[PDB]
Each structure stands twice: as structure tokens, then as C-alpha cells.
Antibody
Framework: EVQLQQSGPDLVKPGASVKISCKASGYSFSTYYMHWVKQSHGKSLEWIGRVDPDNGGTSFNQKFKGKAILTVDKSSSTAYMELGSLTSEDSAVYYC??????????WGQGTSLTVSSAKTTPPSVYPLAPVCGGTTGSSVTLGCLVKGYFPEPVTLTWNSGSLSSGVHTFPAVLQSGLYTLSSSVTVTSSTWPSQTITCNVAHPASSTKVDKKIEPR | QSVLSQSPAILSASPGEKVIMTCSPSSSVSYMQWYQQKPGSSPKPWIYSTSNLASGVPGRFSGGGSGTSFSLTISGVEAEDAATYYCQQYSSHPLTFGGGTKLELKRADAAPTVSIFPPSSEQLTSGGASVVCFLNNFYPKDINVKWKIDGSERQNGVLNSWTDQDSKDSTYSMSSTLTLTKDEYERHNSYTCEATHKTSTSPIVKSFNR
């Protein structure tokens, strides 16, 4: 019912600025202060500021006074937060939470922000078929290596989402400003060469959508 | 300033155990709020006003404390409790959070299932070569992998990544990728992946010969 839907992941070069939006729904918008929290990759949460959607008044965490500029549009029940003078240290996940005179009772899904000088690169997807037999763990594990892409968010499913058990999608590792990721699927031995197994990779940043069928060598 | 310190950082309990989470503010706090955060999701309201459970929180949880020492106690740690818990304050300014407490499940040891995959012919076409090795479903998160190309160990060009503790069986998985140039790849024959884990007296190996 109550819902705060934030804008998508974003990539911007240092020195730029960005305005992330936090669309509110399911309640009286002007009756709750909208707070903005920051989660630095791997680190803890850090509060940015709040805003009275009714009169546009803000309270801030001294440390963010020159960076965040909180505004609201009552017309559509939307709350914004612009970040000026961006640096790498600004790359984090940003949330918008509603406070209810005690704590944050509703949060948006968050907005992944990457501030980098690196260029967006479409991934290169390679199927990992076992070497002429091999695998034995629950009989025959397959792979899908997603290499040399930059905008971190990449989605990997198997058989368009049907294969969901036995899957282990490994978190990306930044190498020279290009991420590498891999996923495995442990299927039943009577299932693989016989049936079709395809790993699907989607990388919105570059508009690529790769459907990669695992054939035996 | 009212800095919140949480301890421990990482907490591992077997299902059914009783766990106490602590949150110390360097100065008296009226109330303490607690949040639960599960990887890939935004935090969720857990406890407000230092003892009130938010909607959806089971009775096995209880918050408490006064002034500069608050706590969150789970009477029977269940599987779904594995997450990082954050305490939050606003008695002072600005609004601060604690460093978090990650609760991870303690379970019986399990040996990993190793798999080695030679370079895809598609990659070789593109003049690159990556040999991959998946060490799956093992328990002691601590594991050691070593690559060898013709008996000679290669610590250069290896990329490792680990997964969060699995929701279904409480195990970890690992991915070890060794990348070489197609020309350097073809200047050899035996490629070996060697895992060293507590579940075995000897190393676990996986190899293939060109």
C-alpha cells in the first residue's frame, strides 16, 4: 500500500551533479518528513537530511550541507535529492525513508550511484561447458562467464528464469575499471545434453541482452 | 555527537541458540531504534522506542536498554534471522546509526564440489583465455585455492569472488578465475585448481590436460 519508488542506478563522471527521485504513494505525502540515508559500499548507513514536504523545510547532517539539496514536488508526491560536486567517495547506495515520529517505517528500494571516470562497456559472455564429462556434484555443473563490462548492474538468469535451484551467481569484481562476473548451475545429469540450458545476461547500461546456450565441446 | 558502537561485528550462532546484540552510544539516548538488513535489500524497521517490535517481527526478538547501553535479544535463532542489524539514534544531532551486527549461521562442515572449465572456444577466438574453477557448497567459509600451470604455481592473473551464506543450506561458494593470453594459454598443457579446506587432510584438485 505505502510505497516509495526511487529512480534507477546511475553512472556519472566526477564533478557532475545528479538528482535522484523518490516517488511516494499509498498515503498523505505532505504529512511525513522525507529523510535521505547513505550506504557506502561495504560500510554502515549515514544520515543525510530530512524535508517537510508541506513547507519545504530541511534538517541536515552538517557533513552534507554543501552537497545535498533536498526539494519536494507536492503536485506529484515526489521527493528529490541533488548531489553537487561529485567524487568517487560519493559512490554509494542512496535511500529515501519516511519517518513516523519514532523511526524509519518505510524505505525506497534505494539508488545505486557510481561516480567514475570509466567508460561503459558491453559485457562479453562465454558459456562454460564441462571438459568432455567432468562434474559430479549433484551430477554436471555448468557455467556462464560475464567478462569485461563496466556499469556494475548486470542481470543473469538461466533458461529465462525457469532454472532457479542450484544457481550460484558470483558478485562482480572490479579489475582495471572493468568488472568480471560468473554464474553456475548444477543440474541433474539426465537433464543437460538432452535439454536446453541457456544463461541470459542483461546489461541495461549498454543496452545488451545476451542469450547464451551451453553446448557440449 | 552520539556515536553508536555495535558488538560484536560478526556473530555466529547455531539455530536454536539465544543471542544478545549490543549497541553502545557514547552518550545517553532516550530511545533506540533497530533495523534488519538482508543483502540486496533496503533496511527494514525492526524495533522502535527501544522495546516495541515493528509489524512483521516475531516474538523471539526483544529490544531493551537505557541511556548508553541498549540490546536486541533473539531467544531462538532461526534461519531467517541471518542478517545485519542496525541500531539508530536521534537524541542528539545529527541522526546516527551503529556499525551493524552481522548474524551468520553456524553449521556442520561440508567439502566443496570443485569444477574446472577450460577456455571457451569463443574466448580463444577473441585472443583471450580464462580458465575457471567453481568451489561450491562448502561450510567453513575459509578456503584456500591455488592455481598451477604445469606444476608451476601461478599467483598472477587470478580473480576470486565469494557468495554470501546461502539461504537454503547455510553454505558458501567460491569462483576462481585465472586469465591468460590465448598465446600464453596455448604454450602449456596441464591446468590445475587446488582447494585447501578443513574438511580434508589432503588438497582437493581438479585438472585437465590440453
Amino acid at each position: 500500500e505505502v510505497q516509495l519508488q526511487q529512480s534507477g542506478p546511475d553512472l556519472v563522471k566526477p564533478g557532475a551533479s545528479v538528482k535522484i527521485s523518490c516517488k511516494a504513494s499509498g498515503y498523505s505525502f505532505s504529512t511525513y518528513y522525507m529523510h535521505w540515508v547513505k550506504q557506502s559500499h561495504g560500510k554502515s548507513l549515514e544520515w543525510i537530511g530530512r524535508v517537510d514536504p508541506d513547507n519545504g523545510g530541511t534538517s541536515f547532517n552538517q557533513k552534507f550541507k554543501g552537497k545535498a539539496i533536498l526539494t519536494v514536488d507536492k503536485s506529484s508526491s515526489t521527493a528529490y535529492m541533488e548531489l553537487g560536486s561529485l567524487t568517487s567517495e560519493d559512490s554509494a547506495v542512496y535511500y529515501c525513508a519516511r519517518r513516523d515520529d519514532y523511526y524509519f517505517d518505510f524505505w525506497g528500494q534505494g539508488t545505486s550511484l557510481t561516480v567514475s571516470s570509466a567508460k561503459t562497456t558491453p559485457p562479453s559472455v562465454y558459456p562454460l561447458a564441462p571438459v568432455c564429462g567432468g562434474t559430479t556434484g549433484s551430477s554436471v555443473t555448468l557455467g556462464c562467464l560475464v567478462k569485461g563490462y563496466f556499469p556494475e548492474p548486470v542481470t543473469l538468469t538461466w533458461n529465462s528464469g525457469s532454472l532457479s535451484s542450484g544457481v550460484h551467481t558470483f558478485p562482480a569484481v572490479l579489475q582495471s575499471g572493468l568488472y568480471t562476473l560468473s554464474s553456475s548451475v548444477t543440474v541433474t545429469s539426465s537433464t543437460w545434453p538432452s535439454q536446453t540450458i541457456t544463461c541470459n545476461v542483461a546489461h541495461p547500461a549498454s543496452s545488451t541482452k545476451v542469450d547464451k546456450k551451453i553446448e557440449p565441446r | 555527537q552520539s556515536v553508536l558502537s555495535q558488538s560484536p561485528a560478526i556473530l555466529s550462532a547455531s539455530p536454536g541458540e539465544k543471542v544478545i546484540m549490543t549497541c553502545s552510544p557514547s552518550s545517553s539516548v532516550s530511545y533506540m531504534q533497530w533495523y534488519q538488513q538482508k543483502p540486496g535489500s533496503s533496511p527494514k524497521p525492526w524495533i522502535y522506542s527501544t522495546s516495541n517490535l515493528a509489524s512483521g517481527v516475531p516474538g523471539r526478538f526483544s529490544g531493551g536498554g537505557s541511556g548508553t547501553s541498549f540490546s536486541l535479544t533473539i531467544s531462538g535463532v532461526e534461519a531467517e534471522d541471518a542478517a545485519t542489524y542496525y541500531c539508530q539514534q536521534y537524541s542528539s544531532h545529527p541522526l546516527t546509526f551503529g556499525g551493524g551486527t552481522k548474524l551468520e549461521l553456524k553449521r556442520a562442515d561440508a567439502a566443496p564440489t570443485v569444477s574446472i572449465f577450460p577456455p571457451s572456444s569463443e574466448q580463444l577466438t577473441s585472443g583471450g583465455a580464462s580458465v575457471v574453477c567453481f568451489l561450491n557448497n562448502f561450510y567453513p567459509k575459509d578456503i584456500n585455492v591455488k592455481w598451477k600451470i604445469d606444476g608451476s604455481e601461478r599467483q598472477n592473473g587470478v580473480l576470486n569472488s565469494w557468495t554470501d551464506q546461502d539461504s537454503k543450506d547455510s553454505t558458501y561458494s567460491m569462483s576462481s578465475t585465472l586469465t591468460l593470453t590465448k598465446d600464453e594459454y596455448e604454450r602449456h598443457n596441464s591446468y590445475t585448481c587446488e582447494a585447501t579446506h578443513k574438511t580434508s587432510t589432503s588438497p582437493i584438485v581438479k585438472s585437465f590436460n590440453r
